[PDB]
Amino acid sequence: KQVSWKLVTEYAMETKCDDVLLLLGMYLEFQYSFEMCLKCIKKEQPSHYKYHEKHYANAAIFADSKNQKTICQQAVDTVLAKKRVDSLQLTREQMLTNRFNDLLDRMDIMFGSTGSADIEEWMAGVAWLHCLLPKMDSVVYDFLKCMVYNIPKKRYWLFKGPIDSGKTTLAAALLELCGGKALNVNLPLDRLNFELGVAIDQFLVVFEDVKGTGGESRDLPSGQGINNLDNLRDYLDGSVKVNLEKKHLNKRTQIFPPGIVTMNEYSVPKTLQARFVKQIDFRPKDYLKHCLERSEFLLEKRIIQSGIALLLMLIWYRPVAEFAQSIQSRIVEWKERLDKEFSLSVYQKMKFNVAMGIGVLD
Amino acid sequence: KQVSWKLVTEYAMETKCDDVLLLLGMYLEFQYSFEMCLKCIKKEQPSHYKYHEKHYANAAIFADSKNQKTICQQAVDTVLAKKRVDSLQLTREQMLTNRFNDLLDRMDIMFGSTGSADIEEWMAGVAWLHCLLPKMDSVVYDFLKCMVYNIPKKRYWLFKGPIDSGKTTLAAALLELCGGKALNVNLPLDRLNFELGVAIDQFLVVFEDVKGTGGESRDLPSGQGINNLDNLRDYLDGSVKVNLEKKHLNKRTQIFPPGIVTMNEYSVPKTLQARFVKQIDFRPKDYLKHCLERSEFLLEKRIIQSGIALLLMLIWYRPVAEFAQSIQSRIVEWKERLDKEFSLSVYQKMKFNVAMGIGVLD
Amino acid sequence: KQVSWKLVTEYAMETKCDDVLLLLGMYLEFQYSFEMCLKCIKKEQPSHYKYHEKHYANAAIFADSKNQKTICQQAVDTVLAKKRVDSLQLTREQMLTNRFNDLLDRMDIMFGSTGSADIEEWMAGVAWLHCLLPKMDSVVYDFLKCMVYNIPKKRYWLFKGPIDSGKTTLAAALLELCGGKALNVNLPLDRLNFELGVAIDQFLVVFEDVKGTGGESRDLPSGQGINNLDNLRDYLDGSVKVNLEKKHLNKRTQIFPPGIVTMNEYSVPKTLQARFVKQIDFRPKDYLKHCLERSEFLLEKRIIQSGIALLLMLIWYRPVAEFAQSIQSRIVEWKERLDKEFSLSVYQKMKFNVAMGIGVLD
Amino acid sequence: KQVSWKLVTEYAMETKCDDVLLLLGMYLEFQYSFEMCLKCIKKEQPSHYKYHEKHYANAAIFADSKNQKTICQQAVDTVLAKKRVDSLQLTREQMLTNRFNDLLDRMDIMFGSTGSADIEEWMAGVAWLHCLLPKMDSVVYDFLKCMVYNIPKKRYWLFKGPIDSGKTTLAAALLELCGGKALNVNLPLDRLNFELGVAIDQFLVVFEDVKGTGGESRDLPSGQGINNLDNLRDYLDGSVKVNLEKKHLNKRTQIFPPGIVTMNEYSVPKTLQARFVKQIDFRPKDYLKHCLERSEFLLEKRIIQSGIALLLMLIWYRPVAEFAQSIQSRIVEWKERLDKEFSLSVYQKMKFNVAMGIGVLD
Amino acid sequence: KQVSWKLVTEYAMETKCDDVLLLLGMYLEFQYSFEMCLKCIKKEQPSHYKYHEKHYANAAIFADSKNQKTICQQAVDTVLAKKRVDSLQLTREQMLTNRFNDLLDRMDIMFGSTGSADIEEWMAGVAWLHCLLPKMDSVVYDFLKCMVYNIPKKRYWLFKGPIDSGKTTLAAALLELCGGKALNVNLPLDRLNFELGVAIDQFLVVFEDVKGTGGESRDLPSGQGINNLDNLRDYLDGSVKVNLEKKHLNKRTQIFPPGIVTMNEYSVPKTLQARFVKQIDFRPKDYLKHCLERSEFLLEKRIIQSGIALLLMLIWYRPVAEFAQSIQSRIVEWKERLDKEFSLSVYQKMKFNVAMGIGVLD
DNA sequence: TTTTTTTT
Ligand SMILES: Nc1ncnc2c1ncn2[C@@H]1O[C@H](COP(=O)(O)OP(=O)(O)OP(=O)(O)O)[C@@H](O)[C@H]1O
Ligand SMILES: Nc1ncnc2c1ncn2[C@@H]1O[C@H](COP(=O)(O)OP(=O)(O)OP(=O)(O)O)[C@@H](O)[C@H]1O
Ligand SMILES: Nc1ncnc2c1ncn2[C@@H]1O[C@H](COP(=O)(O)OP(=O)(O)OP(=O)(O)O)[C@@H](O)[C@H]1O
Ligand SMILES: Nc1ncnc2c1ncn2[C@@H]1O[C@H](COP(=O)(O)OP(=O)(O)OP(=O)(O)O)[C@@H](O)[C@H]1O
């Protein structure tokens, strides 16, 4: 009798697991009899309780194997290969669809009866977030389209505002929605090339709080970020491929992803501002501050930064046809649930409440 | 007949051996006759005497294997896998339960029939610790709670006071209770960027004495930390995930852990000052150090900076319900032992000798 | 038939051999017929003549094997594994008496009927040696106690003094007496990461003649060595475990060994002086030079370097009660032997020759 | 009927071969019929023609093997193992006694019937070398004795003086006589760690023309060598065992070899000067150049660089009693052979020609 | 049946195949039937068409193997091993004769009826080369004999001249003539250690265009070359075996080859100046320039750089007597071909054209 | 995995 390396490879695929120890550990759990498994009876972790019965017989014989890490390494290679194929063949449209489908799957758990989350608290987050900018959901939808099209030159958005104007909050939320990375170009010009290597194969990137010079008039400390950027023109426009470092390893060539730039109100050289479409800017607004102060479970649960919160806002506001055709079925049922759960006047209470700067969950 | 790899792996799981060499050495000890194993008869180490008879026959065959380290490598992977699994499938509350459970196991054996320390020495330790700062047990319990929740921004406590004021001393014990690491930022900014990654997968972190700049106002050596820290604000508040830098080494996207700052009395820009939940002051105390020299077994045995002394201190003050709900069983069992073995009056005598700074024992 | 890996492993354990090439060479000597072995006949090395007969058969078959280095690798692992086990489970006393026993055993040879060197020379060495300092025997008792008791922060000693003050010599004797290890420091801190690997599982370590800074006014060459060590405060203080590198292997984490450091009389930072129990001066008591120049066998034989000279010094001065109990009869036995070979007059005659800087003997 | 790994190992021992590729290359040559082997018939180099006919049988089957490099590695391991066992257990006198036996064997071939060079040209070279320094052969005898005794901190000789004074020349012949390695320390320290790795198990080292600083006043180009070397006091002193690198090898711990430093006359800091027991001040000597110009065969055959020449000098000059007793039988024959083949009057005539600066011969 | 590893090794041997990928690719070409092989039928490369039909069947079986890279590894190591053997066992003269066989083989193909070299153009090259310095043929012969003798500290020639004086041109031809490699010492001192690695087992080296300092007096850019090279003084002298390394290889110890240094008019330190046996001063010359314009087939076919051009010059100018006895017969045949093909007046007309600054042809 | 590169 023999271990089926195939069945392990299935488990790795179905779970999208790609750490050889994470895989090895979880498969070994299945050696004990599913018949009595506490995690199963407690319906505790889906990547366990969905699977324990299926894999039981193979996991038992795997537990005797003299070869365990070799099997897991071949299984891990299979999952990395799948990512590699997808990265080079898929449309950007499909990638976002995949990313969206995964978030909806995790929301099925969070707000399922087994789940711990409260949909009303998360919806309170959407109201506060929606209030942050006029026509927030149109801003979000425009931004998403822009990333999916990745049209050259028309690729980069600028976020301006004072400290605590929320730009870092929203950037993080978008980055959690789409997937991507942040970068810090305030560095001197030697470190920069290794720094930029981070972007390789990412869907999206973000430039955090760049520093100009002479803004210390406005008490904004000087730095070189702008002067670095104003010499990175060819990366921003995305019109032609560039070579990206990574430490020790060889250079690789691709188009530098689209992205977002964030700053306090330093002066922007006219050369650089031409690189941006659609400069958004942010004020402070005392009532949002007072509201957070009276509904701190938002922050304490990290709701306001979540990609899940943005997805909920899109479902609440956008027409179904705006979603990619595959997920439209899941979109319909989530609209259905949300319509069933919040009658609109509930949401009007929440919005009106935030406008009064009182605690959104009155 | 041939070695059971499974039995070796059970022993590794049961004894939580991380190290291939440590595993190999101990398992080879079992090859001699259990039926007169003198180490067992001397009841020296549980890791041997609790297992030798059970593992004996397999250990005999193990000695003749041509392949020994390969068996041990796979067994060690099994233990490391269990860590990685738990590290992604638990509440912070569960982790503390496990941490405390294990320490209590050590107290059980250490103060057992093997009786290898006098509890009173630790109680003098507890008494010394408790007199350091008002309601010292509450300080532990509330800082502890604070670290369990990891609520954003409500995350950093400042410890301040002169040289040799015990701030370093306290943290070392407390960090040993919980698990985590120290850090330094008295650094030109590059060297900050090579520290950061030691925080990876750390439950908690601590800043060693921060050199502020311009310290020579106190005649303190100036160093870089104060401005660096304000220029690190988000790592404090733990609002949004990041990835962190050792030299070279790996990271996985996570929030920067909560923590503690320790300080000789440099200034703070109220920007950085606003980042904190608490200030707590320190000094040497002169009767107390004249007690230490009169009480030196405390320091010889290091108990003064054992987290065990904190665990014991908590058990003396806090009520059973205030504890991890299953382990509450063990809590009463130890409260029974402690309250039986020690009246409040004997504690008051120690506490009084502590108060005099005379050697705690009389 | 086939090689027994067991018998090779026994030889490695029994010799406590440590290097895989050394073992391979050592064992292959046994392949020749025992009956005529010249090394056996003329009793040159215990490591050979004790064993050739016992291992001849297995050595003959070993000499043919196509796997010889693999066999030796497993054996070397077995010796290393025992070291690792003992490093955790033993008391610092138990370790120290193990060390002393091997010295006693060697002396049973070196003054046995073979007795390959003449105890008078060694005692003359011991004379020059105790004559180096006030209370030298008591000073070493204080040192040894300190190293067993292994207290944090109060953990290391400093030697200071001119070129040829002898400080390095005394360290080398204490290093051998304990069986510690020695570490360079005058290097960049990346390279350090693997030198420190030698400190894994050692009773003790030493650092040497560290290049200070600003020394040039005295011709004293400044260097990175001092400033590098400014960082390493936990390693010195022994406040918590640190992980250490080892090559083609796991890293491992433990408290860093206690130790000492020596210097010629550089500057010292006020922050680091804070972390040594004891600082010791050394001087050109030039008449000692005059003697040794004229007593050269002591130096040629490295007698005044030998840890044996200190073990002899200890056997002379200290009461058997001051020794660890288990060996105490061996102390009597050797004490008697020296009394049966010497008297305080004889020592004091030699002592006075050293005091006179005249050749030790008349 | 497969390859005998034993016979391959035996050949490697006989030849004293370390490089696995050199071993592989030479052993393959034996695959063809020795019966006609031109390298045999022309008796070209002895490491072939002595051994070919014996090994041919096994060399044929070796040539078909699929494991070839693996077999050669094990044989190379055996040679390296032998060097390490000898390094620990022989007296330094024995090492040199064995070394002299090898050179004497080569002199049997050099001046045999194969007779590739005549004894008079080397004896002319001896006269040239003895003319270089006052009491040359006495200096040779002193140096050997110093290296054999290996007295700690009295281990190093400094060769100093202007360019083309001959210090490189003299160092070269000693290095051949004793066997050892050259090292260059002028390179940056971070590279240097692996340079010293070559010194493992070596008898002797020579550091070549390290560069100082400040002698630019005379145009001596400045460099790092002195400062690098001054980090290495320990390695010079031989007081204590130190740790040595190799690529992909863990550190070896041993005492670092003694030997020679050459310099054009930069200044030596006191701390470094203190570590040289002797210094020799070479000087340019016009008539040598005019002799050399008319004695070209010396340089072409590299005669004055051979340890062979120094051995011939010692045999001409020293009492038989100074040689280690085992060799003295051979010394008698070489003394006889020399006195047979040369008058003293010829040697006197030669040294006169040298003294005149003329071509050595008339 | 099974792959014959011996036959692949024979192919590698007979093609001198140093690179494992190049070997693999070419051997796999043979798996198709030679009977139709277009590379054979169009006689495109001799290292294919000579061998295809012989190796065919073993190529077909090799094409199925699962070990293909391992077989190529073994074959390539024997090619490397044979060079390693030859490096030690040949005389420098006999090496040079082997190299001349190899160039003379290539010349049989080049100037063959097959192939395309019109020897008229190459003889024009000899004319232009013979103009560059007085007594050109004597200069080349003197260099060759110097390289054979390899006299210690008389090993290096220095080429000085204005930029554009043919100095790298002449070096290029010598390097091909002798075999050997070019090095760049102007690198930063860190990289330099791996640079010198390529010298291993090479016969000759050239240092291109070393920058001095202060030559900005002529607008020579300054750089490190001269400083670095004087740190390598030991390597030039060639008396003793230096240590060399390549990436991931442990060091090899050998005598560093002789060679040429090229530079513009920088000042050169006395120490480094003393290492050169001969200096040659190149200069711009208008007639060569004006000739070369009207003679550009020389440059377009690189005749002026080729070692083949120098060989033709030697064959023209030097007696049969000066070659070694093995090649002398083949030299006579080439002398016969040249004298038949040309005549003095034809050649003299070329030199006359060049000196007149005409195109070489009229 | 070390090593090389990074890091110095
Ligand atoms: N309208 C607002 N008025 C006042 N405070 C606000 C407002 N919106 C958000 N904040 C506060 O700002 C805090 C910090 O948010 P965030 O880091 O995203 O801002 P930011 O503008 O990007 O800041 P910075 O430039 O300092 O990084 C939030 O946690 C919230 O408490
Ligand atoms: N309150 C106290 N009473 C008695 N002794 C104390 C007290 N505080 C500290 N000391 C002594 O000083 C030692 C050093 O304490 P610690 O390193 O924690 O102080 P620190 O304030 O962090 O010092 P520094 O700022 O100088 O680094 C303690 O371990 C203890 O021996
Ligand atoms: N009292 C003394 N007077 C003179 N010389 C002494 C004295 N004590 C020791 N020495 C000499 O010191 C020499 C070297 O000893 P050692 O290396 O231990 O000294 P050190 O002070 O550590 O020197 P360094 O700092 O140079 O390494 C010995 O050979 C010995 O002869
Ligand atoms: N004392 C001398 N007088 C004259 N010529 C000498 C003398 N010694 C050496 N020579 C000549 O100088 C050449 C180089 O000698 P050598 O390399 O030994 O000198 P060095 O002083 O060590 O030089 P450097 O410091 O430059 O390396 C010898 O080959 C010989 O031709």
Ligand SMILES: Nc1ncnc2c1ncn2[C@@H]1O[C@H](COP(=O)(O)OP(=O)(O)OP(=O)(O)O)[C@@H](O)[C@H]1O
């Ligand atoms: N003496 C000369 N006078 C004028 N042009 C020449 C001369 N020699 C060669 N040239 C032409 O110009 C170039 C100059 O020579 P070369 O290419 O060898 O450059 P270099 O300046 O002498 O060398 P390097 O770049 O190594 O310092 C040649 O390639 C050739 O085309």
